[PDB]
Design a protein. Structure first.
Length: 121
């Protein structure tokens, strides 16, 4: 049906926009602290602490499968990245502080993404 096609074209375009957002977020992490999953072989107790691990590579995989239906879903995953980090790592660490900085800088990116998504429909 043409209506199905139109809905698929919208999802594709959202996926495009969310790719640009993901690339911008990742540019705010030059150290690549959040680029890849935490090593379950190297913080061996990680999954006792954190029930829903998240990272940018995992988000890129979901995005390439057109797995985000709306901006809220994508934001949820970015917030997991941040929140998991702030729980596991103490306030005095480079890790906790890198999460705070990313949240602050990424909030700007996500605020404009919300205006574009709303505006474009
Ligand atoms: Na903590």
């Amino acid at each position: 049906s043409m209506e199905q096609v139109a809905m698929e074209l919208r999802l594709t375009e959202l996926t495009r926009l969310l790719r640009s957002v993901l690339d911008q977020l990742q540019d705010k992490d030059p150290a690549r602290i959040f680029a890849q999953p935490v090593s379950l072989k190297e913080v061996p107790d990680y999954l006792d602490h954190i029930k829903h691990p998240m990272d940018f590579a995992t988000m890129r995989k979901r995005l390439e499968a057109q797995g985000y239906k709306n901006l809220h879903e994508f934001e949820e995953d970015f917030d997991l990245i941040i929140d998991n980090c702030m729980k596991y790592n103490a306030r005095d660490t480079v890790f906790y502080r890198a999460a705070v900085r990313l949240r602050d800088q990424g909030g700007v990116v996500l605020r404009q993404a919300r205006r574009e998504v709303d505006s474009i429909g």
